[PDB]
């Protein structure tokens, strides 16, 4: 079968977009069953930048962490890097190490939850799992994926038996009115694969708890860590043998699951939806990098990140450029903000809310439109993967090439919604492969000397920027200190890059562009729009803050 597509011509609005963080409304115009125009409309304003004004810079991380609880930690980290830079302190090796390991744990937790609990329902028909022969599913699993007791006939029959009773109860709960109820042309997977994916979905629910406990060993609690301070981290207990042994044990359990279930479920899915390798690509990619060996400054971060930083324009993997922080700015022309705010570098950022009305094409989102020398930039796992691949990062080269070989597709096919999805799995696998080495390095270092926070002084006037590559991509916090207080604080967040509205030249954002050409098999149940939007792993609380 070829890609299902209807003949529909007219508008489609999806509000709410579920299975993301935050409040998003997507409006598309469709012609002959293909999306021809798109709008990404963010539906909540909170205004953390306004609230931060005049406060103590030390307090920033605590407020900004609450920009988001799905990417918990990452804003605390960025705020801490931002202030560290404004007061010109270099954190100790142990803090770099601990902070980065906390980022690794967050990627593991976050990506795992995204694939199963946010994204999979667009690809897996849960009710179809009830048509499966469990013995046949077992044999199917046991023939393509790593041997495990969770995939045995008994395990699968027990899952199908739970699902059956739930379904026969008449209370479908979170599956109520699902797009796959009664069958859907856009859903390709055989029932045996649905049963397996479903068994794993339930397993992932328990495993994400363990991924969260590991993070909490260092971060203090999860959600919302409480171990970072200006100049480093407070968690001396995090440097000690026993905690670090348990962190390793837990992380090995999580990683077993990534390799036994996530990547295999991911490759199986990509195998069936090979056509999604030609839908939803964009052209420009940006990353600030993460997992740096030298975090003494933003320059050093950009230069020493083990997941490297860079900028790709027009799908040209032969020309990865350096990131120019002076080239970032944000537009608000199509956003619900006061006139005059276009083209602002974040150090000069302005946040002046001004709402008009629902679906006003002139002003249709609470997100700003971040641009890079006039261009929209996609950020996130796919951006990191292309930059790392372009530069020959050894781990990425090996895993990406592994994935291309299993799928029998060329690397250009990764410029797509399927690429975007597969990229997320690729970096998870890489993070997994590095945990033990990273844990050993901090354990050894900590034992020799447990300095974890450095001395510093609050300056009267100054400015600083904190860079990170969060799970959704390039994150930056930007502070102006004046009179020793916060004079300006601006967040420019990965989902702001990906899902913002049009910029001042009326140029679509990455999500809007990616939506063009989307085929719609059934306008009443437009799961194809969700596939693409969800692949960008949207976070509107992060986006708008």
């Amino acid at each position: 079968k070829p890609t299902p597509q209807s003949t529909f011509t007219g508008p489609i609005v999806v509000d709410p977009i579920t299975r993301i963080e935050g409040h998003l409304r997507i409006m598309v115009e469709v012609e002959n069953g293909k999306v021809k125009d798109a709008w990404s409309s963010s539906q909540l304003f909170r205004g953390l930048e306004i609230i931060l004004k005049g406060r103590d810079p030390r307090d920033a991380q605590h407020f900004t962490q609450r920009a988001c609880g799905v990417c918990t930690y990452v804003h605390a980290l960025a705020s801490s890097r931002c202030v560290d830079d404004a007061v010109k302190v270099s954190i100790p090796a142990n803090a770099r190490m601990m902070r980065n390991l906390v980022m690794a744990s967050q990627y593991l937790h976050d990506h795992l939850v995204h694939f199963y609990h946010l994204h999979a329902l667009d690809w897996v028909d849960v009710t179809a799992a009830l048509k499966a022969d469990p013995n046949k599913a077992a044999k199917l699993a046991a023939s393509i994926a790593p041997a495990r007791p969770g995939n045995s006939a008994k395990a699968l029959k027990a899952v199908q038996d739970k699902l059956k009773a739930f379904v026969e109860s008449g209370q479908l709960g979170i599956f109520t009115n699902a797009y796959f109820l009664g069958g859907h042309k856009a859903y390709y997977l055989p029932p045996e694969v649905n049963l397996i994916a479903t068994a794993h979905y339930l397993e992932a629910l328990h495993m994400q708890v363990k991924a969260a406990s590991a993070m909490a060993i260092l971060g203090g609690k999860n959600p919302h860590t409480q171990f970072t301070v200006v100049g480093g981290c407070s968690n001396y207990q995090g440097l000690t043998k026993d905690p670090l042994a348990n962190y390793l044990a837990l992380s090995k359990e999580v990683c077993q699951f990534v390799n036994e279930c996530y990547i295999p479920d991911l490759l199986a899915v990509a195998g069936f939806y090979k056509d999604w390798g030609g839908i939803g690509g964009t052209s420009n990619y940006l990353a600030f990098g993460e997992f740096a060996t030298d975090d003494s400054s933003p320059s050093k971060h950009l230069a020493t990140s083990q997941f490297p930083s860079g900028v790709i324009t027009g799908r040209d993997l032969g020309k990865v450029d350096n990131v120019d922080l002076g080239a970032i700015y944000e537009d608000v022309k199509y956003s619900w903000y006061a006139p005059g705010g276009d083209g602002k570098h974040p150090y000069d950022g302005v946040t002046d809310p001004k709402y008009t009305k629902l679906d006003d094409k002139d002003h249709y989102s609470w997100m700003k439109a971040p641009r890079y020398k006039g261009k929209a930039m996609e950020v996130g796992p796919l951006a990191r993967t292309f930059i790392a691949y372009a530069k020959g990062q050894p781990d990425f080269k090996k895993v990406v090439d592994m994935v291309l070989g299993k799928l029998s597709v060329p690397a250009t096919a990764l410029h797509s919604t399927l690429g975007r999805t597969a990229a997320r799995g690729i970096e998870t696998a890489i993070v997994c492969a590095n945990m033990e080495k990273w844990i050993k390095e901090m354990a050894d270092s900590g034992a020799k000397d447990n300095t974890l926070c450095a001395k510093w002084e609050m300056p009267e006037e100054s400015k600083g920027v904190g860079l990170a590559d969060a799970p959704r991509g390039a994150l930056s916090h930007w502070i102006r200190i004046k009179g020793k207080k916060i004079d300006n604080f601006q967040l420019v967040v990965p989902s702001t890059w990906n899902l913002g509205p049009r910029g001042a030249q009326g140029d679509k954002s990455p999500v809007e562009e990616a939506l063009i050409g989307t085929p719609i098999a059934d306008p009443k149940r437009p799961v194809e729009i969700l596939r693409t939007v969800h692949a960008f792993d949207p976070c509107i609380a992060c986006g708008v803050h």
Binding site: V13, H206, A216, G220, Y355, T451
Partner: protein, 262 residues
């Protein structure tokens, strides 16, 4: 098929940390909860449906013959008719009010729904309010930023099998919020001996000295953190950082500066 109590879960002005907190439950795990114990009939973070299909799931839940309990995550932005916070084209306040009117009970998960939360912090550009203030009805508050899954799932289970648990003056179940963090802190003996850390890089901090001087709000914060821990492994003070007092009303403006007692 024995009937499972309907739960409707709304997201207003929030960061979703509360939803994330809840699925860290282990007694029981979230799948055993929603498969065996309740009927989670609307929950935007995880539900299969989207758009009108999702809005129809909500309405089907609200018109349930068996009735429903309402969980609310997030404060309510009320500026400009509430248009700064919308779902399916409707102000959040409007949908919460409509859902609240017929709910068997309302549980506010997190400090934002209970009291207003971070978006309410000064100067409150969205004119955010806690649920009880915006709607004028009593709520069962499970505050914390976010609260422990033990407290929320605990409350939810109680409300379905026992009734309303005993509440303090701020609407907080005394089963979980009846003691100060400070009284169950393992660093108390240090506080009593005046053994504080003056900085995070100091030897005192390395030795695990009390964090009072670095702004710990433990002595004014009602929560069970040191007794239950988070993630079965840790809590802020155990990781060497002071308590923010994130379970107290309006802590964003009553507990700051965070690194002071000032």
């Amino acid at each position: 098929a024995k009937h499972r109590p309907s739960v409707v879960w709304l997201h207003n002005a929030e960061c979703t940390g509360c939803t994330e907190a809840a699925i860290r439950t282990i007694k029981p795990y979230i799948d055993a909860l929603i498969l065996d114990t309740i009927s989670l009939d609307y929950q935007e973070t995880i539900m299969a449906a989207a758009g009108e299909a999702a809005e129809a799931a909500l309405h089907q839940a609200l018109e349930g013959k068996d009735g429903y309990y309402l969980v609310v995550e997030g404060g309510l932005p009320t500026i400009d008719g509430g248009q700064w916070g919308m779902v399916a084209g409707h102000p959040m306040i409007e949908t919460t009010k409509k859902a609240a009117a017929k709910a068997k009970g309302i549980i506010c998960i997190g400090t934002c729904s209970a009291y207003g939360g971070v978006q309410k912090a000064k100067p409150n550009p969205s004119q955010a309010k806690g649920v009880s203030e915006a709607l004028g009805v009593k709520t069962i508050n499970i505050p914390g930023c976010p609260p422990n899954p033990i407290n929320f799932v605990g409350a939810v289970v109680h409300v379905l099998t026992k009734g309303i648990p005993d509440l303090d003056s701020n609407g907080r179940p005394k089963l979980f919020y009846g003691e100060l963090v400070h009284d169950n802190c393992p660093r108390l003996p240090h506080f009593e001996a005046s053994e504080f850390a003056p900085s995070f890089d100091s030897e005192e901090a390395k030795k695990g000295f009390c964090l009072y001087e670095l702004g710990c709000k433990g002595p004014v914060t009602y929560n069970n953190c040191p007794k239950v821990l988070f993630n079965q492994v840790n809590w802020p003070v155990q990781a060497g950082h002071p308590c923010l007092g994130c379970s107290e009303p309006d802590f964003w403006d009553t507990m700051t500066p965070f690194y002071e007692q000032g």
